[PDB]
Amino acid sequence: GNPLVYLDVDANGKPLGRVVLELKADVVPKTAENFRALCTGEKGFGYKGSTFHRVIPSFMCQAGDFTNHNGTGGKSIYGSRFPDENFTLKHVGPGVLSMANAGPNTNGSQFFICTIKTDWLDGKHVVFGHVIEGMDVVKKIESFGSKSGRTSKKIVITDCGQLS
């Protein structure tokens, strides 16, 4: 079935716990596969050690820039950027996992987890999974954001990988 992956997240060097994500490979196989492989690190690069660099309370938590750590970088397992696969899944509520981008067809490695329904992103960002476990950890991460996106604690994915 669809992959289950995990992110173990610290804030200021102490563990918050684990976020478990189910990836909708039946709907968006290419987007799911990229994320899966960046979690395992099996291509020699990926999310381990990177940060949640932009977090906005009552909106979303953004991460995945493992090259520049600031929202300008990241790369996919296919190349630097890859197309929007489809917009079939919608930003329905808290726990949605979706690709950050810089316009059409600019998916790389950056992603966000929504903490509310964000319907205006439908048709613009590729939704590819959802939080299975660990919304408590997501809410902690959210609580360390600000209106500007700047985080007030250093939020680090210490470990990540695939469960099934």
85 secondary structure, DSSP code: -
- Experimental structure resolution, Å: 1.4
Give the phi and the psi of residue 30 in degrees, each rounded to 5: -70, -40
Which residue segments constitute the domains of the chain, with CATH numbers given?
1-164 (2.40.100.10)
Q: Which residues contact 54 (CB under 8 A, 6 or more apart)?
A: 61, 62, 71, 145, 149, 150, 151
Q: Which of 36, 53, 54, 130 is catalytic?
A: 54
Per the CB < 8 A criterion, the answer to whether 67 and 156 are in contact is no
CA distances from 29 to 21, 80, 104 (A): 15, 18, 18
Q: Strands, E, within 2-152: which ranges? A: 4-11, 14-23, 52-56, 60-63, 96-99, 111-114, 127-133
Query: Which helix (DSSP H) or strand (DSSP E) does residue 161 occupy?
Result: strand 155-162
Q: Which of 125, 128, 130, 144 is catalytic?
A: 125
62 belongs to the catalytic site: yes
77 secondary structure, DSSP code: S
